Enzyme design. Structure first.
Site, PDB file in Angstrom:
ATOM      1  N   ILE A  95       0.884  -1.201   0.000  1.00  0.00           N
ATOM      2  CA  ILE A  95       0.000   0.000   0.000  1.00  0.00           C
ATOM      3  C   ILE A  95       0.908   1.234   0.000  1.00  0.00           C
ATOM      4  O   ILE A  95       0.667   2.150  -0.778  1.00  0.00           O
ATOM      5  CB  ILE A  95      -0.992  -0.006   1.190  1.00  0.00           C
ATOM      6  CG1 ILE A  95      -2.082  -1.072   1.043  1.00  0.00           C
ATOM      7  CG2 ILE A  95      -1.634   1.365   1.395  1.00  0.00           C
ATOM      8  CD1 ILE A  95      -2.916  -1.204   2.269  1.00  0.00           C
ATOM      9  N   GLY A  96       1.922   1.253   0.847  1.00  0.00           N
ATOM     10  CA  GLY A  96       2.898   2.357   0.869  1.00  0.00           C
ATOM     11  C   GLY A  96       3.581   2.472   2.196  1.00  0.00           C
ATOM     12  O   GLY A  96       3.461   1.573   3.018  1.00  0.00           O
ATOM     13  N   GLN A 126      -4.582  11.184   5.517  1.00  0.00           N
ATOM     14  CA  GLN A 126      -4.079   9.852   5.080  1.00  0.00           C
ATOM     15  C   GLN A 126      -4.464   8.765   6.084  1.00  0.00           C
ATOM     16  O   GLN A 126      -4.450   7.591   5.680  1.00  0.00           O
ATOM     17  CB  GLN A 126      -2.552   9.778   5.005  1.00  0.00           C
ATOM     18  CG  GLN A 126      -1.861  10.652   3.971  1.00  0.00           C
ATOM     19  CD  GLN A 126      -0.363  10.394   4.003  1.00  0.00           C
ATOM     20  OE1 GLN A 126       0.309  10.499   2.987  1.00  0.00           O
ATOM     21  NE2 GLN A 126       0.192  10.020   5.159  1.00  0.00           N
ATOM     22  N   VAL A 153       6.287   0.103   6.654  1.00  0.00           N
ATOM     23  CA  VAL A 153       5.587  -0.205   5.388  1.00  0.00           C
ATOM     24  C   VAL A 153       4.250  -0.861   5.729  1.00  0.00           C
ATOM     25  O   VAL A 153       4.144  -1.617   6.720  1.00  0.00           O
ATOM     26  CB  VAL A 153       6.420  -1.086   4.456  1.00  0.00           C
ATOM     27  CG1 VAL A 153       7.666  -0.352   3.983  1.00  0.00           C
ATOM     28  CG2 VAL A 153       6.754  -2.416   5.108  1.00  0.00           C
ATOM     29  N   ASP A 211      -1.951  12.107  16.077  1.00  0.00           N
ATOM     30  CA  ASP A 211      -1.411  12.330  14.731  1.00  0.00           C
ATOM     31  C   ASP A 211      -2.482  12.141  13.663  1.00  0.00           C
ATOM     32  O   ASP A 211      -2.199  11.516  12.637  1.00  0.00           O
ATOM     33  CB  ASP A 211      -0.171  11.462  14.491  1.00  0.00           C
ATOM     34  CG  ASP A 211       0.503  11.792  13.176  1.00  0.00           C
ATOM     35  OD1 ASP A 211       0.560  12.986  12.833  1.00  0.00           O
ATOM     36  OD2 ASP A 211       1.103  10.878  12.536  1.00  0.00           O
ATOM     37  N   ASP A 256      -5.231   4.097  13.408  1.00  0.00           N
ATOM     38  CA  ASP A 256      -3.960   4.184  14.195  1.00  0.00           C
ATOM     39  C   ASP A 256      -4.169   4.910  15.544  1.00  0.00           C
ATOM     40  O   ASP A 256      -3.166   5.352  16.096  1.00  0.00           O
ATOM     41  CB  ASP A 256      -2.826   4.759  13.321  1.00  0.00           C
ATOM     42  CG  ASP A 256      -2.363   3.904  12.154  1.00  0.00           C
ATOM     43  OD1 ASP A 256      -2.821   2.720  12.029  1.00  0.00           O
ATOM     44  OD2 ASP A 256      -1.489   4.349  11.352  1.00  0.00           O
TER      45      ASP A 256
HETATM   46  O1  LIG Z   1       0.544   6.151   8.426  1.00  0.00           O
HETATM   47  C1  LIG Z   1       0.442   7.106   7.624  1.00  0.00           C
HETATM   48  O2  LIG Z   1       1.051   8.164   7.772  1.00  0.00           O
HETATM   49  C2  LIG Z   1      -0.396   6.962   6.370  1.00  0.00           C
HETATM   50  C3  LIG Z   1      -1.051   5.626   6.177  1.00  0.00           C
HETATM   51  C4  LIG Z   1      -2.277   5.365   6.758  1.00  0.00           C
HETATM   52  C5  LIG Z   1      -2.855   4.126   6.641  1.00  0.00           C
HETATM   53  C6  LIG Z   1      -2.301   3.222   5.792  1.00  0.00           C
HETATM   54  O3  LIG Z   1      -2.838   1.945   5.672  1.00  0.00           O
HETATM   55  C7  LIG Z   1      -3.987   1.782   4.956  1.00  0.00           C
HETATM   56  C8  LIG Z   1      -4.308   2.573   3.871  1.00  0.00           C
HETATM   57  C9  LIG Z   1      -5.423   2.273   3.165  1.00  0.00           C
HETATM   58  N1  LIG Z   1      -6.207   1.237   3.529  1.00  0.00           N
HETATM   59  C10 LIG Z   1      -5.957   0.455   4.619  1.00  0.00           C
HETATM   60  O4  LIG Z   1      -6.735  -0.471   4.871  1.00  0.00           O
HETATM   61  C11 LIG Z   1      -4.752   0.702   5.297  1.00  0.00           C
HETATM   62  C12 LIG Z   1      -1.122   3.471   5.147  1.00  0.00           C
HETATM   63  C13 LIG Z   1      -0.515   4.693   5.319  1.00  0.00           C
END
Ligand SMILES: O=C(O)Cc1ccc(OC2=CC=NC(=O)C2)cc1
Length: 288
Positions: free
Chosen positions: A10-11, A124, A17, A120, A138
């Site tokens: 995903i990124g 995103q 990651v 935070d 988170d």
């Molecule tokens: O942590 C950050 O700064 C940005 C971030 C937030 C959540 C992320 O994970 C998901 C993104 C999309 N769909 C999901 O189910 C999970 C990834 C990156």
């Protein structure tokens, strides 16, 4: 992976990651977060397996194997940052902004009532689905892991001024500030305070809201990174900052962006604000 299959990266996340993965035993698609590397964090994050609500991204599992740590969450197809970018020509429709804000306040009121902060919030980590829900991702992790987990460029745009002024303690109010910034960005289609360093961030806030003083923020001048030499900017009207938001929305936003954290509206009180009199739950147009 022993227990999953990777469908894609995903990124980069705040903590490491992030993968879209399929549980090998159940076939479900989940978000798998590798924590970039601690005994304290496992028990404390494991308690977040109990912090369940419709507007909070479900923590399915905490996996500590091979001296690696991986959080497993319920997968959602889009985040608010990408949805705002996709919606930039028209804007997100106001009923959907209002629905999104209302739901995000429900999630914060739930977590705050259980003595869990986010610290935070940013577009995103606000995740959306096709059914019109938005969920906070988170919550609780900053306290549990805080604080070096990435070399990627950290966004300061949603950071409350008390934290930019070096207070080393946090309150529920930091999350209300961030959500106020996100509200303003949904409405105007521009970030409210897009700083690229702590002092640029703090001076962008001061140029809009006025440089704080002891009248509006008792104690501000004694905070660790406060300097008497800060420039003295006058405060702008919200009517200039977030048009065409109506006076209900501007009143609510002003209460979310008070300088003194103690004066900031709570999530529970914000849910009762007149701005939400006509709240509904529209269907978003998601292109996946
Ligand atoms: O942590 C950050 O700064 C940005 C971030 C937030 C959540 C992320 O994970 C998901 C993104 C999309 N769909 C999901 O189910 C999970 C990834 C990156």
């Amino acid at each position: 992976m022993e227990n999953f299959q990777k469908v894609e990266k995903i990124g980069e996340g705040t903590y490491g990651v992030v993968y879209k993965a399929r549980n090998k035993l159940t076939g479900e698609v989940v978000a798998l977060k590798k924590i970039r590397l601690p005994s304290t964090a496992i028990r404390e994050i494991s308690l977040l397996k109990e912090l369940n609500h419709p507007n909070i991204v479900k923590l399915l599992d905490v996996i500590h194997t091979e001296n690696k740590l991986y959080l497993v969450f319920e997968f959602l197809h889009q985040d608010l940052k990408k949805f705002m970018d996709a919606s930039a020509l028209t804007g997100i429709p106001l009923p959907l902004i209002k629905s999104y804000l209302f739901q995000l306040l429900q999630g914060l009121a739930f977590c705050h009532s259980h003595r869990v902060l986010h610290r935070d919030l940013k577009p995103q980590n606000l995740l959306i689905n096709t059914e019109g829900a938005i969920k906070l991702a988170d919550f609780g992790l900053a306290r549990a892991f805080l604080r070096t987990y990435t070399h990627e460029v950290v966004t300061l745009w949603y950071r409350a001024p008390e934290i930019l002024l070096g207070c080393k303690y946090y309150s529920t109010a930091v999350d209300i500030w961030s959500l106020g910034c996100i509200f303003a960005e949904m409405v105007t289609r521009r970030a409210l305070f897009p700083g690229d360093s702590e002092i640029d961030q703090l001076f962008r806030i001061f140029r809009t809201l006025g440089t704080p003083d002891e009248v509006v923020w008792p104690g501000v001048t004694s905070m660790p990174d406060y300097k008497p030499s800060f420039p003295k900017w006058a405060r702008q009207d919200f009517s200039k900052v977030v048009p065409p938001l109506d006076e209900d929305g501007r009143s609510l936003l002003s209460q979310m962006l008070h300088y003194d954290p103690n004066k900031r509206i709570s999530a529970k009180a914000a849910l009762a604000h007149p701005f939400f009199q006509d709240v509904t739950k529209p269907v978003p147009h998601l292109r996946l």
